[PDB]
Amino acid sequence: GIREKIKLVSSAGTGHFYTTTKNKRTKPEKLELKKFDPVVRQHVIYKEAKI
Amino acid sequence: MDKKSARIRRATRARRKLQELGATRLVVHRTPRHIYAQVIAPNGSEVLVAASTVEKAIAEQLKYTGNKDAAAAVGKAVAERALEKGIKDVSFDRSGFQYHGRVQALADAAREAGLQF
Amino acid sequence: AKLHDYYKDEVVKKLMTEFNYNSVMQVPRVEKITLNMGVGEAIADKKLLDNAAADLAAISGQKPLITKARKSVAGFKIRQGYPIGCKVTLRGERMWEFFERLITIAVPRIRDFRGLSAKSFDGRGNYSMGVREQIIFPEIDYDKVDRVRGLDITITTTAKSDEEGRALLAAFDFPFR
Amino acid sequence: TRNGRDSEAKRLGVKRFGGESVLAGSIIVRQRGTKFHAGANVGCGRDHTLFAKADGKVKFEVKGPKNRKFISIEAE
Amino acid sequence: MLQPKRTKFRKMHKGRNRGLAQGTDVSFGSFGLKAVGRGRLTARQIEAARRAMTRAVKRQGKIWIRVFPDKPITEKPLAVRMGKGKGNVEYWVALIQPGKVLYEMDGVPEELAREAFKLAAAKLPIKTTFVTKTVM
RNA sequence: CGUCGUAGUCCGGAUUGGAGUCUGCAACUCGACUCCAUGAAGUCGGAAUCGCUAGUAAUCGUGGAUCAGAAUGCCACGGUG
RNA sequence: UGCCUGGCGGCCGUAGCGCGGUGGUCCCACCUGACCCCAUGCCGAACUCAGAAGUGAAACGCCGUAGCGCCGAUGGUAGUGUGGGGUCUCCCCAUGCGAGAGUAGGGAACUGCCAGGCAU
RNA sequence: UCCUCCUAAAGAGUAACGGAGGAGCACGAAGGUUGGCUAAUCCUGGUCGGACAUCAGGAGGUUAGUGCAAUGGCAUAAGCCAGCUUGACUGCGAGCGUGACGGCGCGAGCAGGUGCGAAAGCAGGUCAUAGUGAUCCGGUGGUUCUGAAUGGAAGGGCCAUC
RNA sequence: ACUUACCAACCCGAUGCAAACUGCGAAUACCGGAGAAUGUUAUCACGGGAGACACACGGCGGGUGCUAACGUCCGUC
RNA sequence: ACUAUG
RNA sequence: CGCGGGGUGGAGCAGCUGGUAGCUCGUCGGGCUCAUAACCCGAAGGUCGUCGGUUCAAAUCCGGCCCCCGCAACCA
């Protein structure tokens, strides 16, 4: 359905991402989450991007 | 629903949890005039130590039986009886009473005297 | 202050001898006084409901809880959780200082006033009345009404029957027929 | 629309019965709701699958106000 | 013609018809028509038999009907190479076990009521008897 | 000469309530006029359509016949124009 | 040792719901007040704190009552495992198990640990 | 193809062009945690307000709710409302269940590092059961691997993902 | 405002029916443990070699059909 | 821009 | 029966993507004419076949019942 895929990308400049879904119409504003980067081995901010 | 039954309803989840853990629990029972406290065994029937603002050793000292400065005296008393009988680890059962003011002040006076929670 | 000190002295003793209660606790007490403004056309615009609130803010003297729609229902055209009214609940000091300024000034000042209807009790001892307009109260500065807007009162009481309700309110000098 | 359709059978039910001795981890009952609840040494999973947390013999019983069937355990 | 107003399900399994009846006593009236064998009353049968006994008393009396046709029954139409689903519901039946009371009468005498239930019995497919009420 | 200020108003007077006056054997059905109160419609009228060439149209009052009483009609009279 | 109350339990309607009676020295409840801790999508209603003038009315607890719930045999009936038989859509015989409903009847719970109060 | 009920004979499983219905998604909150709360419906009174809307009280006891079928659950709520947040974490996993196999499901507990809570604790998505697609080929990012004389690179691998 | 021989929700009493109703509930079967006797190890695991995957009727429990069929589709012997 | 009938 | 489509003011039609019913003719009232027709002006009128569901809400989504069309009903 109208429920597209997205990378969340780490703010430490490892190119580690999580991938997840988002409704683009009902929420336009960009998704920002703390999550565990396993390369540096810390919790870190992760921001939206294109899959 | 009167206040006593609603307070038990609040308490019940805490206590069912503390059964399956198998924990010794410091039950407290606040009243407008008084405040009570028991340490109850892992099985959940038999009591090990008690203190309260009725039992006369503690009542003699105090100004008034049902306020913060009473509760600090009772929380002091239960620790000093429990440490005699080899009881360090307990889990503080607030029994449907907000952790705050008088019940808070009981618990923080039991942490002072070194009863671990 | 005034009506509450009046209750403790004059009314308690007088309703003991009338009904023969045994303990002093059984005498009816005035629990609360609930206001209301069942707007219904804030579906039009929410500034009606602000003017509704700020009226009740003036009349009572404390901030009103705006109420949401419990259900949806079609004849009104309402979503569930549309703001469809406001209220205040008055107790303690702010009850009695309102309950004075009802009896004293703003019951006289109703137009075409032939008392208040004594069969408007609900069956276990609480009174309810409309007022057609808010201008009967002092603080509603007339020259500043955008619109005349009615209002309900509801005096809630610790009373068994409507008989003991009509005892208690009549014993404050509450103007009935 | 007409008929023709059913799902695949999900092989629920009790697996280990009372008396039967288990190893911690062993599932005891798969189930949709909580026909049975967890007592002593027993986990409710997330699909309400009930499993041993210790080795021992399974015990069923009834308990509490509502007469609910608890699976518990007697660690040997 | 008797037939429930609405049900849950249009169609029902065939089932069996074993065992003896509940509803053995004559409760409502003085007399009654107890079944002795075992089958199905259709709804047309139950009606045909009411119209016999009603005619026969000249409307004195009161009549109770104790059985209701609430099982539906399907038939396939003519030529239907089997399968292709279950048939349409043609008609309705009650199942009857040995001992069910079917009709009850009072407000007539035992002369007339014997003759009314004889005239009903000829419309029904199952063997029947006359019974009077027992005090316990 | 004063006053009202563009408002359904100190515009408009319909309608209804109350109390009267007069004529008349008699004002219920159904008279006119007065007083107090009430204060509708109506903000210049669609298609269409009428009258008038000078003391005319427009507008303002006055009188008469009929008639106990009952004229916004009818017949007549002058004013302004 | 007895009587009364509070807390934590075991037990899960023989234990509950109603109806009637009763308890305040302590206990408990309502109760008095609120600048402070804290609180209300408004409100000291609740939660909370500071208290102790009043009251057992409500609530709670205790006692009584078979009005409603609740439990409930014996016997018989239904069903059915194995073997056999029929008039074989359904039954019967030998044998083993044996309900549900109902009936008599029972029943106004029983029981533990700790604290406090009155009597002895 | 998948999910739910019945058929199915009180463990599991069990056919038919047998009887009934659903899915091919949604949600950064509708997830996590701490604290609090308890429904439908009907009756009585009350400005405009009517059978139906906000207010008060009483009866009632989940007849309600649970994002969506059905079933089983649910008051310690799994239902409803607030505060703070990202455990809708990474590495693993004793041991179970379920499949012919490919596979699918449950999982205490260990390590790293988070969130809520005073603490005991709880959290590896949602009350559970549908919401899906093997391999090949190719694409995008990363990498202590490889690199056809040697140094690079191209391509290949491994990890993430389309 | 008044009378009603008309339909009559809920509650009350008596009375039946249900595969997809259950405040009840067997017999059997199934899982587990202990104990004799008995059975040519009949259980399980690992290798070599298959065949077979059109079944039929009879009894019992059911679906479907008309409780039609030497009918059809499951279960168990 | 007009128009048909009795 | 197998498949599909359609029932809307009096007539023929549009609206069917849930929250809003339009178009041409006819009817009614007023004008023009000696009168009628044409022509000009003004006003109304639709249980959306029927029963029942779903939703807060149904012309509209979903089911049964009734009528009306169209296509198919073959190989022996």
Coordinates of C-alpha atoms (C1' of nucleotides) in Angstrom, one line a residue, chain H:
Chain H
rU1 C1' -1.7 -18.8 -1.8
rC2 C1' -2.9 -17.3 3.2
rC3 C1' -6.2 -16.6 8.0
rU4 C1' -10.9 -18.0 11.3
rC5 C1' -15.3 -21.3 12.7
rC6 C1' -18.0 -25.9 11.7
rU7 C1' -17.8 -30.9 9.3
rA8 C1' -13.5 -33.6 12.8
rA9 C1' -16.0 -39.0 16.0
rA10 C1' -13.8 -34.6 24.2
rG11 C1' -4.9 -35.1 22.4
rA12 C1' -2.8 -34.0 17.4
rG13 C1' -4.1 -34.7 12.3
rU14 C1' -8.3 -35.8 8.8
rA15 C1' -11.6 -35.5 2.6
rA16 C1' -15.6 -33.4 -0.9
rC17 C1' -17.2 -28.5 -6.9
rG18 C1' -19.6 -29.8 1.9
rG19 C1' -21.6 -25.3 5.3
rA20 C1' -20.1 -20.0 6.8
rG21 C1' -16.9 -15.5 6.7
rG22 C1' -12.0 -12.8 6.0
rA23 C1' -6.5 -11.2 4.1
rG24 C1' -2.8 -9.4 -0.1
rC25 C1' -2.6 -4.2 5.2
rA26 C1' -2.2 -0.3 9.1
rC27 C1' 0.7 2.4 13.4
rG28 C1' 7.2 6.9 15.4
rA29 C1' 2.2 5.9 18.0
rA30 C1' -2.1 2.5 17.6
rG31 C1' 5.5 0.6 20.1
rG32 C1' 8.1 0.9 25.4
rU33 C1' 7.6 2.2 30.6
rU34 C1' 5.8 4.7 35.2
rG35 C1' 1.3 6.6 37.4
rG36 C1' -3.9 6.7 37.3
rC37 C1' -8.9 5.2 35.4
rU38 C1' -13.5 1.4 34.4
rA39 C1' -17.9 0.0 30.2
rA40 C1' -22.9 -0.5 26.9
rU41 C1' -28.0 0.6 27.5
rC42 C1' -32.3 2.6 30.0
rC43 C1' -34.8 6.0 33.5
rU44 C1' -35.4 11.3 36.3
rG45 C1' -34.2 16.7 36.1
rG46 C1' -32.2 20.6 33.2
rU47 C1' -31.5 27.6 28.2
rC48 C1' -31.8 27.3 22.8
rG49 C1' -32.1 21.1 22.7
rG50 C1' -36.1 17.8 19.4
rA51 C1' -36.1 9.9 19.8
rC52 C1' -30.6 11.4 19.3
rA53 C1' -26.0 15.7 21.2
rU54 C1' -22.7 19.1 26.4
rC55 C1' -24.6 19.0 32.5
rA56 C1' -26.3 16.3 37.2
rG57 C1' -28.0 11.9 39.6
rG58 C1' -29.8 6.8 39.7
rA59 C1' -30.5 1.9 37.9
rG60 C1' -27.3 -1.8 35.4
rG61 C1' -22.8 -4.9 35.8
rU62 C1' -18.9 -5.6 30.5
rU63 C1' -25.1 -7.1 27.4
rA64 C1' -18.9 -2.7 26.4
rG65 C1' -14.1 -2.1 24.3
rU66 C1' -10.0 -4.6 21.8
rG67 C1' -7.4 -0.4 14.0
rC68 C1' -9.8 -4.9 10.5
rA69 C1' -13.0 -11.6 9.7
rA70 C1' -13.9 -15.3 13.0
rU71 C1' -12.5 -17.9 17.2
rG72 C1' -10.0 -18.2 21.7
rG73 C1' -8.6 -14.6 25.4
rC74 C1' -8.6 -10.1 28.4
rA75 C1' -10.2 -6.3 35.4
rU76 C1' -3.4 -7.9 37.9
rA77 C1' -7.1 -5.6 32.5
rA78 C1' -4.5 -7.5 26.9
rG79 C1' -9.8 -1.9 27.5
rC80 C1' -9.3 3.9 28.6
rC81 C1' -6.2 8.6 29.9
rA82 C1' -1.7 11.3 31.2
rG83 C1' 4.1 12.1 31.9
rC84 C1' 8.9 10.8 30.1
rU85 C1' 11.0 8.3 25.8
rU86 C1' 12.9 4.7 21.0
rG87 C1' 14.1 -2.4 23.5
rA88 C1' 10.0 -1.3 16.4
rC89 C1' 18.4 -2.2 20.0
rU90 C1' 23.5 -5.3 18.0
rG91 C1' 25.8 -10.0 18.9
rC92 C1' 23.9 -14.8 20.7
rG93 C1' 21.0 -18.7 22.6
rA94 C1' 20.1 -24.2 26.9
rG95 C1' 16.0 -26.3 25.3
rC96 C1' 11.1 -27.1 23.1
rG97 C1' 7.3 -27.3 19.3
rU98 C1' 5.9 -28.0 13.9
rG99 C1' 6.9 -29.7 9.1
rA100 C1' 8.8 -35.1 3.4
rC101 C1' 12.3 -31.4 2.6
rG102 C1' 12.9 -26.1 1.6
rG103 C1' 11.4 -24.0 6.0
rC104 C1' 8.1 -21.8 10.0
rG105 C1' 7.3 -20.8 15.4
rC106 C1' 8.3 -20.4 21.1
rG107 C1' 12.4 -19.4 24.2
rA108 C1' 14.7 -18.6 29.8
rG109 C1' 19.5 -17.0 30.0
rC110 C1' 24.9 -14.5 28.5
rA111 C1' 27.7 -10.0 26.5
rG112 C1' 27.6 -4.9 24.7
rG113 C1' 25.0 -0.4 25.0
rU114 C1' 19.8 2.3 25.9
rG115 C1' 14.7 3.9 28.0
rC116 C1' 11.1 4.2 31.9
rG117 C1' 10.8 3.5 37.4
rA118 C1' 12.5 5.7 44.2
rA119 C1' 13.0 0.4 43.8
rA120 C1' 11.7 -4.8 43.0
rG121 C1' 11.7 -4.8 37.9
rC122 C1' 9.8 -4.4 32.7
rA123 C1' 11.2 -3.5 27.4
rG124 C1' 14.7 -7.6 21.3
rG125 C1' 7.4 -4.1 18.4
rU126 C1' 1.5 -4.2 18.5
rC127 C1' -3.9 -9.6 23.1
rA128 C1' -2.9 -14.1 19.7
rU129 C1' -3.8 -16.4 15.1
rA130 C1' -3.8 -13.4 8.0
rG131 C1' -1.2 -8.8 5.7
rU132 C1' 2.8 -12.9 1.3
rG133 C1' 7.0 -15.0 -2.9
rA134 C1' 12.4 -19.8 -3.3
rU135 C1' 16.6 -19.5 -6.7
rC136 C1' 19.0 -17.1 -10.8
rC137 C1' 20.1 -12.1 -12.9
rG138 C1' 21.1 -7.3 -11.6
rG139 C1' 21.2 -2.5 -8.5
rU140 C1' 22.8 0.8 -4.0
rG141 C1' 25.9 1.3 0.4
rG142 C1' 29.8 -0.7 3.5
rU143 C1' 34.3 -4.2 4.1
rU144 C1' 40.7 -6.8 8.7
rC145 C1' 38.8 -11.1 2.2
rU146 C1' 40.3 -11.8 -3.1
rG147 C1' 43.0 -9.3 -7.2
rA148 C1' 45.8 -14.6 -13.2
rA149 C1' 54.2 -11.5 -13.9
rU150 C1' 54.5 -7.2 -9.8
rG151 C1' 51.9 -2.2 -7.9
rG152 C1' 47.2 -0.6 -8.5
rA153 C1' 42.3 -1.2 -10.6
rA154 C1' 38.3 -3.8 -13.0
rG155 C1' 35.5 -7.9 -11.6
rG156 C1' 34.5 -11.8 -7.7
rG157 C1' 33.3 -12.8 -2.2
rC158 C1' 31.4 -11.4 2.9
rC159 C1' 27.8 -7.9 5.6
rA160 C1' 23.5 -4.5 5.0
rU161 C1' 19.7 -3.6 1.6
rC162 C1' 16.4 -2.9 -3.2

